[PDB]
Amino acid sequence: PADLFSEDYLVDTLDGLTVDDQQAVLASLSFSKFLKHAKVRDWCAQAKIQPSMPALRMAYNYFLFSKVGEFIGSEDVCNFFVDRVFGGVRLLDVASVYAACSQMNAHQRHHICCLVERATSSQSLNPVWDALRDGIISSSKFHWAVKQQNTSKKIFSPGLRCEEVVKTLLATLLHPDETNCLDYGFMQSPQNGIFGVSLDFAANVKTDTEGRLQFDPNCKVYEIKCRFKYTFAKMECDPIYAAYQRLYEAPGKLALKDFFYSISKPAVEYVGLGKLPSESDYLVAYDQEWEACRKLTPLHNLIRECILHNSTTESDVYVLTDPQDTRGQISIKARFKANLFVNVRHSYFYQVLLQSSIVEEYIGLDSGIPRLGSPKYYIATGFFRKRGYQDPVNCTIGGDALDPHVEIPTLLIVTPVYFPRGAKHRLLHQAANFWSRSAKDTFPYIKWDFSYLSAN
Ligand SMILES: [Mg+2]
């Protein structure tokens, strides 16, 4: 194990262990192991001590980054606590660190969370990624925290190649004339410290003077998914390929339907009037033209409201050029609208819902005159094909070369997602209640004061 309270240098702790064992040391730097440590337990045993969120999460961030900052090359987080939060003193004990963190304002917490985001922008390549995400309801767990709450996931512990291709498509083909961000770290909520997200891609988002992210009030945020069930090869007997050929030569909604229904578990579901969508995939059609063959009750009022707000703006479909024709270049061949909409019951709806809440929280804390407009949210779905013997070695999107070991993108669908306010408020409240119950049962020796948390 590693000691967040030890004064030993992490580089020395890790020196002389296998990479396997180093991974274990780093996993031990989690919020859960922090709260389980003898020194937190001892502090928490006192009658006067009733720890609050987000203050205890801020305290953890300090100890975490004091331990790991040098190893991951970002001493900015620790410097800020010491200089701006601790009055210039290098605090080492949990009682003092906690007290000073308890005295932070929302702009200081915002600043810390922004520095942490910047320190973690390489996401799962960063050795502290897994440890930092512990104890937090992240956007990939948000549906589970609201609707499931079972042992399929945990709050506390006490593929990527194709996603990168889709980012390149968004950046190069959809937003060539704009400032975009391709690499986002982990953004904790500065107001509660129980929620957090990382984003896949955003357009109209920049680094500011020193040296954090700036979301424009009108930025465009995209969650990227890849549909591996639809990966085909240009072979004689391949039924997906058959449907793809038709779509490529004649881009439109009918060719698209045949493509969707060329597999046994289709990504699109027809949902009739007053009927409850299943959770099976994340696109739904409300028009009978997509049919190729449970009612909403009065208690599904939140679902009804979400459908109401997600049944107007259509998806954009981008058919890409085939690099077997162009010997390399992949650009937009054709573009068309499809009456396909987000499934408001699907876990991806809940994922973007939480990313919207965190993005809007950070925009709210940003200094400056508030401007007219709110950000827009999308799911960007990529579809792919195997490389064949006659495909070029070197494919490109704009300047960017594709790794020769990644599949070729064929199709991009961009689907808008809208979030009614009352609906977001209810779901975040249920998830926060589940966080609080789970914190009390997991760390029952902590006299949690959730007064501040329920204010948020
Ligand atoms: Mg993604």
Question: Would you kindly provide a written description of the structure presented here, covering whatever features stand out?
Answer:
With 456 residues, the chain is α+β, with helices and mostly antiparallel strands. The protein folds into two domains: 1-136, Herpesvirus alkaline exonuclease, N-terminal domain (Four Helix Bundle (Hemerythrin (Met), subunit A), Up-down Bundle); 137-456, no CATH class. It has helices at residues 10-14, 19-27, 31-36, 38-44, 55-72, 76-85, 94-102, 106-119, 129-133, 142-148, 160-174, 239-249, 253-260, 301-308, 323-326, 347-365, 421-442, 451-455; strands spanning 137-138, 180-181, 187-188, 195-197, 201-207, 213-226, 268-270, 283-285, 315-320, 332-338, 341-342, 376-385, 396-397, 400-401, 408-417. The strands form four sheets. The protein has a seven-stranded mixed β-sheet with strand order 2-5-6-12-15-9-10, sandwiched between helices. A hairpin with a 6-residue loop joins strand 3 and strand 4 (195-197). Helix 5 (55-72) crosses helix 6, helix 5 (55-72) packs parallel to helix 8 (106-119) and helix 6 runs antiparallel to helix 8 (106-119). It is globular and about 70 Å long. Bound molecules: magnesium ion. The PDB classes it as hydrolase. Keywords: ENase like PD-(D/E)XK Superfamily, Hydrolase. The assembly is monomeric. Crystal structure of the Shutoff and Exonuclease Protein from Kaposis Sarcoma Associated Herpesvirus.
Report a brief summary of the structure:
InterPro entries: Herpes_alk_exo (IPR001616), Restrct_endonuc-II-like (IPR011335), Viral_alk_exo (IPR034720). The chain is an alpha+beta fold.
